[PDB]
Design a binder for this molecule. Structure first.
Ligand SMILES: CCCCCCCCCCCCCCCC(=O)OC[C@H](COP(=O)(O)O)OC(=O)CCCCCCCCCCCCCCC
Ligand SMILES: CCCCCCCCCCCCCCCC(=O)OC[C@H](COP(=O)(O)O)OC(=O)CCCCCCCCCCCCCCC
Ligand SMILES: CCCCCCCCCCCCCCCC(=O)OC[C@H](COP(=O)(O)O)OC(=O)CCCCCCCCCCCCCCC
Ligand SMILES: CCCCCCCCCCCCCCCC(=O)OC[C@H](COP(=O)(O)O)OC(=O)CCCCCCCCCCCCCCC
Ligand SMILES: CCCCCCCCCCCCCCCC(=O)OC[C@H](COP(=O)(O)O)OC(=O)CCCCCCCCCCCCCCC
Ligand SMILES: CCCCCCCCCCCCCCCC(=O)OC[C@H](COP(=O)(O)O)OC(=O)CCCCCCCCCCCCCCC
Ligand SMILES: CCCCCCCCCCCCCCCC(=O)OC[C@H](COP(=O)(O)O)OC(=O)CCCCCCCCCCCCCCC
Lengths: 176, 148, 258, 150, 148, 258, 148, 149, 175
């Protein structure tokens, strides 16, 4: 999740170890090795000591990613993975791809930030007002000519989604 | 999901108004708008512990309340006016009314003894004979200085 | 419009009962639902620390102050009547049979009823709870279950400590400050307490408060809206309700036993 | 269809809570066996100054029952107190007398009973025959000072 | 950690000790005073002011509390069963226990006298003679009407 | 390490003083600093309805409950001492000099002390306050100043309403439920109240703690850390501190007038 | 809006009305209560229990309250100043003023016994004779030591 | 150094809070309108069973001051009660006596003073010469029951 | 300010009007014209009715931009476009339109480097207490400053450490 969703009452070590101690009864020494290698893979190995509020906002998400990749899931979902970044956002967008190509695990990056999504995405979707508004590879979705999707994939402030709000004519608005 | 919403709203409004009215009726003593207790008067020489809203009684059992007490400006005595439960309507006129004391240290109530036997009452009339309340100072003056 | 205001009022009225029933289902699923893998007694201990042990200085200092208030006051009113030895009995009777558990429910709804909803509603806003079901641990059993257990078995203990410190502080101001005869305090105290109607009475009145306080404090947080203001509104709703669930339920518990 | 179930459970517990906890009403103190069963009797007195309801009747100090009601009989202008008697204590003879006594010195005026001397006991719903009425401070001091000392 | 467990245990013990203090010390309950005490029965003519958990004493000092009071179906007297601490076990059988009033207006406890030098006790037996508890009514009756 | 724990303790000690002085400077700059352009009486009214009028149902229902409790209790304690017609003055002494204002300070620290710290503390997290100084309106005078004035002039009023409803509810349970003689309630009540030591006493005791209740409730919000958890910790610190400053300050205020 | 400025003002009025109820219908200072009253002096030899805001009475019913107690520097006696209701303005000068103990353990109230004389008062004048408040020490000294 | 000024003001407020406790601050039996303008006096009694501190001393019922302390003089084995007297009352002669009375029947045992007659009054810090001590119930009932009746 | 920093007790109209009623005493009908034309400029003209919590996240920022541009300031700084594409587009178009049209200085302060450089003309970088260089977006794109080339691009590892200060991957893992 964005903002990490880190268990506040647990330290970073027990935080990353939590998915282990749930589905698995492993020796507390073997569990530490699994937690340590994970925290290394995200770079947050040195902070195996801290509490999730003693961590900066950027690193709070990497330890949560390490908690996720614990137990070695085969798919893993990233909600708002790259919201508030630039160097922090770079390491995270590199990790979400490394974890995919290396571990061969399905990644579902779900963020409104289109640039970096399309950067790492391979089959990007668009969801709008209850229905999937098309989908495809990032380039085939770049010029699909769907007014809503061409309005989303680019800036284009005005389009199917109204730029102006539903009000009365401005001419008479201040006149009357 | 819209017809019963306003229904529960009106149910709750009526319940709140019901609570308000069932609370309000405590003041304005809740025996309708008036009661059924007829008055009577009594003249004492000292009512030291007969402050308002005491108990009047016969044979120990409470008959009614003491409504008011007053220093009648002519005789310098005490006029006590007291309500009587309407069922209690057979005390003869010659009945006496003396200020007793609740147990040993309780608030002084007034107790009526039947006295004689004649015309009962008008229930709003006045009592004639009585024994006034005791005062500890006169008591000890009679006991110590006079007798002993 | 009036037709709009009454519709909004009826919607809130039915919504209240919807929440009153959802809270009951939540308490059910929390207390006796299942046994999820992440549970244990370590959770209950960690909670008992944050709910009771952290709430220990507040209620102890408050019990001392309310005791040296009760005594410093009743001595003043009872001297007029003439009864003076019994200040130890009167001070103890009010605190042990009523005001003790009530003020403990007011301070436990305030400290550990707000620091409980805030702690379990921030757990909802930051997706700390949603990230538990997707792990596979039922948050009602891993997060809510120890918090409810910590409240049930700490607020009666805090109320007993409150009554003890209040009685002792009332002694320390009656005896050492107001100069009433020392031994008479505890003597007049213990001959007229009637344990089954003062100690066990207040203790049941405090248990009843703890179940209704730690549940409307653990639910208000679990069912807040996930935002920095939804949490701050829930941590106020849980003080209001848990003060109304302390006072009102104390009126219904003291009608049962005067 | 969840919200409907939630409202149903709210009504269920809410309806149950009011009946189980409130209504502040009639006693159900194990009315399945022996009820703490008590049968009334009447007692004619002459002054009942402090036998107010929620008092106690007794024999030789230990409680026998409570006073249920006090009444002024409109004919004799005297007091009739109706009280309860524990079922196990059911050997109170007829000429046994009642008398208003005081607990300690400033206690509530209860009604003690002294055993009489006949065989037949009661129907537990009859009245008493003779008694000693309650004393009052005014009559007490009037008989003390004015007659005996003076 | 372990300091959390230590604190939780410490203050869990503190609360339970405060409960046991409110029970044993503040209320004056059985457990501390119960210990090892042996019962004794006593027949009185009137027990007007002795209540359960009322002290039993000798020469002024408490030896235990009374346990229960009974109205015997046979002799119409009061049978009080009372505990007595084990250490005090030299009370003779011919001893006369009576009902005394603590101070002047305190509760009526039971104080026992010295019963000569015959067989001591069975600690579960009954006492033979007594002096019943006084009552104000018979007191003032014998004082005013008969003597003066 | 121990040398670390004691350093942290001393830091927390000196910081508690630093904050207690910063709060005084804050109250000064808020109450008598200047007159910023955005001020008026409309702010005080808008804050008077959110600090007092919204806190009206809680304290009214609580006063009714606590009154029917104090009467339903003291009657049981008074039924043994013969002072039966003296239960009226009890629900008007044990509810008008010490418990009325104290329980009102406990419910006003809980509702409008926690709903005023999570409302003035959530404005600091969302930069609602910082966006005021950059407009040019001193937030201490536009935001904090009205809340300070709507606490000062509402908690004594709420305490008076609390005492009135508590007295009336005690009547409604003594008279209509417990059957004590109606007129004696108010009669025995008003002959032994001694206004200058009961009514004005409790009213000054309510102004004192009530002023403190809305000063350490509007400061803890203003000096929280701007995050969804800093606000939730401040809205708990302001219930703890405003319960201590109600109880202990009531001891300090009752030691002056018994 | 005005939906609040009326709500706010409504309850700003409700609270002030509650304050006035506390000051008037809960304490009874002055709405029709004790009003125009005129002062009277009294010289006593001992006022041991006569406190401020007492009750000066006649025939049991209250006449007013006592205002101030003082030790006169010349005769070392107790000068009390007390209020007398305006409706009661027919007390003769020769009338006596004793200090009677209310009931048996109540507060010491001043009680006036009418002597009977054509001249009444100036309501601002003083009383001539009295009977001082009794003290138990001298009482029992005359009882035990002197009398018997 | 803002923290320095904040701590300074916090200490200034803590100081007033320390003096806000008012645990027996002013010491008297009444308000300061009358003031503390009182001077001591001693009294030798034989039995002071109920003359606990912070009581009252009076003449003709109206209070004069409050008792300050009670002492046991190790030489003559009697009681020495030291009390205060309001300055406006400065006319109590030496030959006057003090005696422990009781407020009503179950009140606190105050001490009254009976004025005799003599020109010289006091030095307000001297000691009284005669008295009548406080009677206990036991000596009273012993004198009553066994001796007279 | 990011998240709107909208006065909750005030509605959108009085929200936008607040800077006017402070420095200015204008007729309440003239304040309405400016608030109306200011809210229409951001596109949030129809929601002159709502409360700031009845507004969506992205829409709430637009009303704040209107409150800011009230009184017609000559410079305006928007700390934190973030956590929102179509909305971000209208916002990044408005911060430029308000600049070129009104001729007002804009100080965009956001981490989102891409869109910043998109609208920025002289972009700065602030790090560990000191300004770490500055310049036009392209001259800052390849300044060869290790910290600034590490910021202006992804490059997870550089002057700012990717790894935390651990002890040893051989020792801590085995010891
Ligand atoms: C033993 C089982 C335990 C179950 C419960 C035990 C007793 C608890 C009693 C609940 C007390 C309710 C007070 C709630 C006050 C409140 O929330 O008050 C605060 C709320 C706050 O509103 P919001 O929900 O918008 O925040 O106020 C309102 O909603 C306005 C008035 C609503 C009041 C509704 C009352 C419902 C009571 C049920 C009766 C309706 C019958 C339905 C028939 C169709
Ligand atoms: C003949 C001799 C003449 C003297 C006899 C009179 C002596 C008796 C004095 C009368 C005093 C009196 O009426 O009263 C005296 C009584 C009886 O003595 P106790 O003090 O031992 O009870 O005292 C009390 O009333 C005790 C007060 C207890 C208060 C408890 C708290 C109340 C509510 C708690 C929950 C909320
Ligand atoms: C000895 C017997 C054992 C006692 C057992 C305890 C009973 C348990 C009662 C449960 C209480 C309800 C909890 C609801 C859970 C929750 O979070 O409830 C939350 C919801 C509110 O929903 P929202 O989130 O929409 O505001 O409901 C409430 O607001 C509950 C308020 C509780 C108030 C308690 C008042 C009870 C006193 C009534 C006295 C009336 C007397 C009138 C006479 C004049
Ligand atoms: C010469 C200078 C000496 C310094 C004097 C400073 C003393 C004041 C502060 C007390 C110490 C607080 C430590 C904080 C504890 C902690 O861990 O810190 C815990 C909390 C705050 O930290 P959290 O973030 O953990 O909540 O601190 C508190 O609870 C603050 C305590 C407030 C008490 C101060 C006011 C009391 C006034 C009464 C004084 C009169 C005494 C009467 C007895 C005779
Ligand atoms: C017989 C039923 C039992 C009676 C009591 C039941 C207990 C629960 C009801 C108490 C009221 C809950 C309000 C919670 C506070 C709150 O929401 O907090 C204060 C809120 C503020 O609303 P916000 O959610 O907008 O901040 O005010 C309201 O809008 C609440 C409206 C409810 C008004 C009803 C209560 C008024 C008087 C109470 C009854 C009178 C008693 C006399 C009758 C004999
Ligand atoms: C919570 C309860 C705390 C105190 C409640 C009552 C305190 C004493 C109880 C009465 C004892 C009997 C005294 C007597 O002889 O009787 C005293 C009088 C009886 O006088 P009358 O019989 O002459 O009218 O009644 C009272 O008890 C006085 C008023 C009681 C108000 C209590 C004072 C405030 C206490 C605050 C603590 C909280
Ligand atoms: C024999 C034992 C007796 C000892 C009695 C001690 C009583 C002490 C009084 C308790 C008060 C505790 C205050 C808690 C505040 C706190 O912790 O203070 C700590 C907090 C801040 O702490 P943080 O660092 O945790 O944020 O302070 C504030 O936020 C501001 C509160 C300031 C208000 C202080 C109260 C002073 C009242 C002065 C007015 C008096 C008027 C009277 C005139 C007649």
């Amino acid at each position: 999740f964005q903002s990490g969703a880190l268990f506040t009452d647990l330290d970073v070590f027990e935080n990353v170890a939590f998915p282990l101690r749930v589905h698995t009864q492993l020796p507390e020494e073997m569990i530490r090795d699994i937690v340590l290698m994970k925290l290394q893979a995200v770079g947050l190995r040195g902070a195996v000591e801290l509490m999730p509020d003693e961590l900066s906002g950027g690193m709070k998400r990497r330890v949560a990613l390490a908690r996720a990749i614990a137990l070695d899931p085969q798919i893993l979902l990233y909600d708002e993975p790259f919201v508030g970044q630039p160097i922090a956002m770079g390491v995270l967008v590199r990790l979400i791809r490394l974890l995919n190509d290396a571990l061969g695990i399905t990644s579902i990056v779900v963020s409104h930030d289109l640039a970096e999504t399309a950067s790492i995405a391979d089959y990007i979707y668009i969801v709008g007002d209850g229905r999937v508004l098309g989908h495809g590879t990032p380039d085939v979705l770049k010029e699909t000519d769907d007014p809503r999707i061409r309005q989303f994939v680019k800036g284009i402030p005005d389009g199917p989604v109204p730029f102006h709000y539903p009000a009365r004519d401005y001419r008479a608005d201040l006149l009357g | 999901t819209r017809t019963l919403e306003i229904g529960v709203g009106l149910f709750l409004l009526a319940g709140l108004l019901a609570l308000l009215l069932l609370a309000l009726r405590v003041s304005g003593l809740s025996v309708g708008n008036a009661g059924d207790t007829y008055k009577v008067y009594a003249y004492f020489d000292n009512i030291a512990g007969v402050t308002v809203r005491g108990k009047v009684t016969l044979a120990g059992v409470t008959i009614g309340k003491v409504t008011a007490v007053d220093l009648d400006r002519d005789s310098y005595t005490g006029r006590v006016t007291m309500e009587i439960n309407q069922n209690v309507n057979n005390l003869p006129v010659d009945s006496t009314a003396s200020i007793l004391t609740a147990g040993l240290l309780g608030e002084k109530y007034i107790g009526i003894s039947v006295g004689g036997d004649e015309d009962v009452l008008k229930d709003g009339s006045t009592i004639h004979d009585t024994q006034s309340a005791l005062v500890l100072e006169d008591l000890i003056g009679k006991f110590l200085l006079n007798s002993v | 419009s009036p037709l709009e205001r009454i519709r909004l009022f009826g919607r809130a009225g039915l919504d209240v009962v919807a929440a009153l029933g959802r809270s009951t289902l939540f308490l059910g699923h929390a207390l006796l639902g299942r046994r999820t893998p992440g549970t244990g007694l370590h959770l209950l201990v960690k909670q008992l620390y944050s709910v009771g042990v952290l709430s220990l200085a507040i209620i102890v200092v408050s019990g001392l102050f309310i005791g040296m208030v009760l005594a410093l006051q009743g001595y003043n009113i009872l001297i007029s009547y003439g009864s003076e030895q019994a200040v130890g009995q009167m001070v103890a009777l009010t605190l042990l049979r009523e005001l003790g558990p009530v003020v403990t429910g007011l301070l436990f709804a305030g400290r550990a009823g707000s620091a409980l909803t805030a702690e379990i509603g921030n757990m909802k806003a930051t997706e700390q709870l949603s990230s538990l079901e997707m792990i596979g641990v039922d948050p009602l059993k891993y997060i809510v279950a120890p918090r409810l257990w910590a409240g049930f078995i700490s607020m009666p203990l805090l109320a007993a400590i409150f009554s003890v410190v209040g009685i002792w502080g009332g002694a320390m101001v009656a005896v050492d400050w107001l100069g009433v005869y020392e031994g008479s305090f505890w003597a007049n105290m213990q001959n007229s307490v009637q344990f089954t109607e003062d100690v066990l009475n207040g203790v049941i009145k405090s248990i009843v408060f703890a179940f209704v306080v730690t549940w409307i404090a653990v639910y208000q947080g679990y069912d807040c809206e996930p935002t920095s203001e939804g949490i701050s509104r829930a941590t106020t709703r849980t003080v209001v309700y848990a003060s109304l669930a302390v006072l009102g339920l104390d009126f219904i518990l003291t009608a049962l036993m005067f």
